Amino acid sequence: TKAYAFGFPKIGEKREFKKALEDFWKGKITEEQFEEEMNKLRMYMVENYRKNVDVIPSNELSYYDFVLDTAVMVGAVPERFGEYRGLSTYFDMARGGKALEMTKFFNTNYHYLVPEIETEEFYLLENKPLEDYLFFKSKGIETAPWVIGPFTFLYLSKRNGEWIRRPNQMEKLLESLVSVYKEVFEKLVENGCKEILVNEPAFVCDLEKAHWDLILNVYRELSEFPLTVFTYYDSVSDYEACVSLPVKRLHFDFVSNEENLKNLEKHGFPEDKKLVAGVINGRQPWKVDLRKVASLVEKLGASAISNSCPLFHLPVTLELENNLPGGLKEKLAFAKEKLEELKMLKDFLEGKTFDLPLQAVERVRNLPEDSFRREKEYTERDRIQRERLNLPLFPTTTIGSFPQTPEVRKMRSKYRKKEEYEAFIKEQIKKAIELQEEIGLDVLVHGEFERTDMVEFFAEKLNGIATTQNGWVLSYGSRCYRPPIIYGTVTRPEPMTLKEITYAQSLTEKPVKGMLTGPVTIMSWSYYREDIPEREIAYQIALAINEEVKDLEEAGIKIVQIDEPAFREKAPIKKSKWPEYFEWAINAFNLAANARPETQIHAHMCYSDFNEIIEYIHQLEFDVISIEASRSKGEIISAFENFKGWIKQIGVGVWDIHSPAVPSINEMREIVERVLRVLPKELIWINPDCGLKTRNWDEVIPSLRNMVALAKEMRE
Numbered sequence: 001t002k003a004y005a006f007g008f009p010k011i012g013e014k015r016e017f018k019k020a021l022e023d024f025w026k027g028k029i030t031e032e033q034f035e036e037e038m039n040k041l042r043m044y045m046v047e048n049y050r051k052n053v054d055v056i057p058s059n060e061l062s063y064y065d066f067v068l069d070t071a072v073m074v075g076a077v078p079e080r081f082g083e084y085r086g087l088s089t090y091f092d093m094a095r096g097g098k099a100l101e102m103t104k105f106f107n108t109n110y111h112y113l114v115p116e117i118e119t120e121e122f123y124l125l126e127n128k129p130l131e132d133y134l135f136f137k138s139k140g141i142e143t144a145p146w147v148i149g150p151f152t153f154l155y156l157s158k159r160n161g162e163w164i165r166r167p168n169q170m171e172k173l174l175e176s177l178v179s180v181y182k183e184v185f186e187k188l189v190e191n192g193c194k195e196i197l198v199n200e201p202a203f204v205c206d207l208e209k210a211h212w213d214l215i216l217n218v219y220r221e222l223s224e225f226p227l228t229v230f231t232y233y234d235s236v237s238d239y240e241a242c243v244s245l246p247v248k249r250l251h252f253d254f255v256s257n258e259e260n261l262k263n264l265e266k267h268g269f270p271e272d273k274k275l276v277a278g279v280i281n282g283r284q285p286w287k288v289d290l291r292k293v294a295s296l297v298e299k300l301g302a303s304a305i306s307n308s309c310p311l312f313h314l315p316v317t318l319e320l321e322n323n324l325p326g327g328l329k330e331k332l333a334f335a336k337e338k339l340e341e342l343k344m345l346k347d348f349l350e351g352k353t354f355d356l357p358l359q360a361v362e363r364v365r366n367l368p369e370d371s372f373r374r375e376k377e378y379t380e381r382d383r384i385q386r387e388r389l390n391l392p393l394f395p396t397t398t399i400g401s402f403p404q405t406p407e408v409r410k411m412r413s414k415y416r417k418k419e420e421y422e423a424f425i426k427e428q429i430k431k432a433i434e435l436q437e438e439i440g441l442d443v444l445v446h447g448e449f450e451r452t453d454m455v456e457f458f459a460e461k462l463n464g465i466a467t468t469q470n471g472w473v474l475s476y477g478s479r480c481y482r483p484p485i486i487y488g489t490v491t492r493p494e495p496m497t498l499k500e501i502t503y504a505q506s507l508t509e510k511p512v513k514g515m516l517t518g519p520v521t522i523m524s525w526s527y528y529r530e531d532i533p534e535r536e537i538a539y540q541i542a543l544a545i546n547e548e549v550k551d552l553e554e555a556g557i558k559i560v561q562i563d564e565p566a567f568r569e570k571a572p573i574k575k576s577k578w579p580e581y582f583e584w585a586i587n588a589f590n591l592a593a594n595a596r597p598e599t600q601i602h603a604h605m606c607y608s609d610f611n612e613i614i615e616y617i618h619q620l621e622f623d624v625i626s627i628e629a630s631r632s633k634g635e636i637i638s639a640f641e642n643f644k645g646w647i648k649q650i651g652v653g654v655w656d657i658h659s660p661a662v663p664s665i666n667e668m669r670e671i672v673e674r675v676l677r678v679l680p681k682e683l684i685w686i687n688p689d690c691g692l693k694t695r696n697w698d699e700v701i702p703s704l705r706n707m708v709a710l711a712k713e714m715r716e
């Protein structure tokens with residue numbers, strides 16, 4: 001049994017990767033020092049592989065992003081960066097002022113950099129696969145370079161501001177592209193490379209027959225090389241076309257979906273090649289019953305095994321996590337432990353090893369069918385809310401978070417590392433409330449000074465959810481986070497945000513909004529049990545959140561905001577599966593947002609465009625939705641304008657909070673004036689695009705004053 005693994009985390013057990021990057025960016029260390037740090041990580045990674053599997057990947061230590069690495073390999077460096085000068089340029093492309101766009105890698109919380117294709121001509125600018133292959137080879141360690149395949153690379157790239165995903169857009173680029181892959185592979189083989197790991201996750205996307213025609217041509221041109229093709233994150237819809245590819249080894253993800261297995265049972269698997277069975281989950285941290293896995297492997301008739309999808313979605317190691325809820329650690333397995341499972345699975349399959357390792361649940365299961373809608377419909381709630389709030393036309397507000405002083409950051413760190421902290425928080429809130437009132441904002445926020453991030457803050461306060469000490473996972477570049485683990489029934493023992501919001505409201509006559517995170521978002525940034533349906537977990541969390549809403553309502557809070565960024569982001573990769581997904585995502589949100597008619601519910605959505613989801617948005621029980629309209633100068637409004645029967649209020653983001661610039665009153669006006677083209681003025685709120693936690697006070701205060709001034713003008 002041939003054992004593969006891929007995507008082992010690169011960050012190191014002590015996050016040496018993060019420290020190396022930031023120490024280089026801040027100049028604390030030289031480039032030669034940086035490369036020495038990197039070389040340590042390389043060896044650490046392969047040593048983990050060497051101890052556990054048969055095929056050892058190289059070219060996996062990307063200094064920022066592997067898609068960016070691919071772009072550089074094929075010479076796709078945009079004109080604005082000029083001559084490619086190595087690391088300096090690389091990091092300018094990744095994190096510079098004019099950096100490439102960053103976006104989510106398929107349906108995961110990893111973010112890659114979007115290549116920009118300016119020329120139709122690709123060339124070999126740098127051969128990192130050969131470089132890394134020789135690095136390990138010189139040490140007497142044979143490795144298989146890990147590369148992003150030509151189709152997927154193009155599929156993840158943009159040209160002229162748009163994806164390159166229509167078959168008629170890809171053809172010519174593919175021809176030039178493949179030529180560069182041919183050169184790279186030839187160099188590898190000429191140097192004695194025996195196997196190359198080609199990643200083609202885009203094969204699991206909604207493709208047409210014409211895509212597969214192009215893909216067929218690409219791999220015909222590469223059929224002389226020893227390639228193993230990997231696919232993951234979902235099933236490959238056109239199974240027959242996929243197993244027809246002229247490659248000798250093909251990997252499928254048999255964990256994230258049922259269709260791969262079903263299709264394999266139907267059409268069988270070509271004798272002309274070998275199956276690599278991706279059967280150990282790369283995305284969840286649960287130890288599996290290896291006897292069950294072994295049986296699956298036999299049913300598949302596979303002679304090779306591996307993880308289903310990249311291991312870098314897991315933390316490095318469980319070893320030192322010794323303050324987890326009793327009995328939990330024994331059910332877990334992080335990246336290192338996943339390699340060990342593969343080794344054990346191989347050992348078992350080869351015969352070398354014989355020993356292998358309600359009250360709230362009822363509420364959910366028995367939810368009345370009426371629980372998923374609010375008491376009164378929008379039109380009637382609206383009159384009640386407006387009468388209660390007495391807001392002016394074009395009310396102004398903000399999205400929730402405020403700038404964090406070094407003091408605020410340090411204090412929060414100290415506390416995490418109670419009475420003194422609370423006092424400090426109450427102090428910053430008073431200041432923020434007074435500042436907002438002085439500026440003349442209509443609806444206020446408490447600023448979220450007490451929160452690290454919108455998921456961890458709540459995860460830490462919910463039963464059934466654990467948080468780790470060192471379970472770091474790379475989000476992008478040098479930024480890591482620790483995903484919570486939803487290990488049991490989720491409930492909310494005590495109020496989570498009452499203290500802060502209540503105090504805040506007691507300082508002003510103006511409405512102060514409650515500030516919560518939705519259920520799907522909490523799930524999306526966490527690990528969770530697989531023996532229970534996603535929807536039931538979401539509902540549990542949603543009911544817990546609704547507990548907070550009621551408590552907020554009881555304390556007299558008139559407005560509650562529920563941020564659900566994962567609404568679209570957790571949608572399946574396959575469009576055909578959307579309706580079933582949104583059915584429960586909608587239900588989950590509505591359970592959380594089940595508020596009295598008198599309570600105005602706000603929902604913030606970060607999406608750059610709502611055209612594909614407007615139909616699902618229309619089913620949510622919010623009263624106000626805030627959108628980020630600045631970057632499109634208001635054109636994002638099109639989806640709402642063209643939705644016959646849109647009657648809900650819209651919070652128009654008129655200010656790009658990812659920039660230090662203070663927008664002029666006219667710059668904001670352009671946006672507000674655009675949204676007012678069709679929609680009635682009574683629906684329009686004015687706010688920033690998003691939270692202000694990344695901004696500085698010096699730029700926020702002037703921007704807010706301009707926002708208020710604009711509202712005043714607009715009313716007149």
Ligand SMILES: [Zn+2]
Nearest residue numbers: 605606689690
């Ligand atoms: Zn946002």
